Design a protein around this ligand. Structure first.
Ligand SMILES: O=C(O)[C@H]1O[C@H](O[C@@H]2[C@H](O)[C@@H](O)[C@@H](O[C@@H]3[C@H](O)[C@@H](O)[C@@H](O[C@@H]4[C@H](O)[C@@H](O)[C@@H](O[C@@H]5[C@H](O)[C@@H](O)[C@@H](O)O[C@@H]5C(=O)O)O[C@@H]4C(=O)O)O[C@@H]3C(=O)O)O[C@@H]2C(=O)O)[C@H](O)[C@@H](O)[C@H]1O
Ligand SMILES: [Ca+2]
Ligand SMILES: [Ca+2]
Ligand SMILES: [Ca+2]
Length: 399
């Protein structure tokens, strides 16, 4: 079968659980589409009631920041008439405004401006859908795919620059505040039975290094690459190339969403993470199998300096096997970041800078997470992970 008609293997990670992940493999002939712009993509997907099996082939580059006639849209196109960047900044400057939450005219106009862009860039994927890139050059630019449904396959696409024109100031976000944006490349919002495979996620032409600092903080236009939230469950992400990006993969969005417990069952294998700052993945609550991934970066880099790989968040149950980390000067302990509520981590075969380490013991964590994965393919020796992943991960490695 071609990539359009293939299904996730019956042993291939948490996505193969119960009914599994077939996407739109069983689609009838009038439910197979080829799309090369925003209009065609949106016609193809249709609405949430469009649940028959379907296959969607992406041909070339699809820019999501366009109008109904496909003309490029920008800041002034989305801008609420009452929004102004100068006046937003004057309004909420810590010096005069303090640490209270931004409110009043500018923030309200910013929130309306954001919903204007959102309406173009953000798109829901209906149940029983396969979306695959044709050839080696399928791209989605500015786009944020959202999956709230069941049974979706996404393969062989380069996702670039999920860029928010209206970042929000949060003075209470960390010790000196932060700017936060809304668009991921893919948001799995209560979505189930999902396979994301042979995709590439990057920040395109607008990396964070082209953004100014306001209030001494990076004016952050980006959010996640592949985030999972609100009871997302039964997901495999395999052979993806994540590079040149700050916050990659946040699984479980809130310490309060105790309902995520027993959910966020996600399998990450054979993914490349180059020049990613943090959260690869950051986990709350979930049984996440992380194996045969390769991480590479620099703590002293000028655009995307390495902070951590695995986030041990509240009640997280990460089971890590034979992952390879290449960050010069990094200690065994600093491969991960431990958050309150985080007490446990299984890891075996972890290689840091060519040396075998125990990341869990290095951090004083419990070595058992109360589960062992049964659904997985072959496990590479740590000694072959770097080669296998570099050669195989990302868009345009198949076609
Ligand atoms: O309005 C809607 O349409 C949506 O509403 C619901 O959504 C909200 C929100 O709108 C979504 O963007 C998303 O956001 C998540 C968090 O609420 C948000 O704070 C953020 O979080 C991460 C991380 O979880 C958090 O701890 C923190 O990180 C610190 C620090 O800020 C960083 O700078 C760094 O030092 O790391 C730290 C750390 O790791 O702890 O901020 C992080 C960040 O991304 O900046 O982003 C989350 C996310 O993107 O998923 O979901 C929210 C939610 O309530 O679930 C609704 O759920 C949704 O369906 C829409 O309708
Ligand atoms: Ca934040
Ligand atoms: Ca976020
Ligand atoms: Ca997100």
């Amino acid at each position: 079968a071609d990539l359009g008609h293939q299904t996730l293997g019956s042993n291939d990670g948490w996505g193969a659980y119960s009914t599994g992940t077939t996407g739109g493999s069983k689609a009838s002939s009038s439910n197979v589409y080829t799309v090369s712009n925003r209009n065609q993509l949106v016609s193809a997907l249709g609405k949430e009631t469009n649940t028959t099996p379907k296959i969607i082939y992406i041909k070339g580059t699809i820019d999501m920041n366009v109008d109904d006639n496909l003309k490029p849209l920008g800041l002034n196109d989305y801008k609420d008439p009452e929004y102004d960047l100068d006046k937003y900044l004057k309004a909420y400057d810590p010096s005069t405004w303090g640490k209270k939450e931004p409110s009043g005219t500018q923030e309200e106009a910013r929130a309306r401006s954001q919903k204007n862009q959102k309406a173009r860039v953000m798109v829901d994927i209906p149940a029983n859908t396969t979306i695959v890139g044709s050839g080696t050059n399928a791209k989605v630019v500015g786009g944020n795919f959202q999956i709230k449904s069941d049974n979706v396959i996404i393969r062989n696409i380069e996702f670039q620059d999920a860029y928010d024109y209206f970042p929000q100031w949060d003075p209470t976000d960390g010790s000196s505040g932060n700017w936060n944006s809304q668009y991921d490349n893919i948001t799995i919002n209560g979505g189930t039975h999902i396979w994301i495979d042979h995709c590439t996620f990057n920040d395109g032409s607008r990396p964070d290094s082209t953004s100014p600092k306001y209030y001494g903080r990076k004016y952050q236009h980006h959010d996640g690459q592949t985030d999972a939230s609100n009871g997302a469950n039964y997901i495999t992400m395999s052979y993806n190339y994540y590079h040149d990006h700050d916050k990659s993969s946040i699984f479980g969005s809130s310490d309060s969403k105790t309902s995520d417990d027993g959910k966020l069952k996600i399998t990450l294998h054979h993914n490349r993470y180059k020049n990613i700052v943090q959260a690869a993945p950051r986990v709350r609550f979930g049984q996440v199998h992380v194996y045969n991934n390769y991480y590479e970066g620099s703590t002293s880099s000028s655009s995307y300096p390495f902070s951590y790989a695995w986030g041990i968040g509240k009640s997280s149950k990460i089971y890590a096997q034979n992952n390879v980390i290449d960050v010069p000067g990094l200690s065994a302990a600093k491969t991960i970041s431990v958050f309150s509520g985080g007490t446990a981590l299984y890891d075996s075969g972890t290689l840091l800078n060519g040396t075998q380490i125990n990341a869990s013991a290095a951090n004083g964590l419990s070595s058992s997470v109360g589960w062992t994965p049964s659904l997985h393919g072959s496990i590479d020796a740590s000694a072959n992970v770097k080669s296998n992943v570099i050669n195989q991960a990302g868009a345009g490695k198949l076609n």
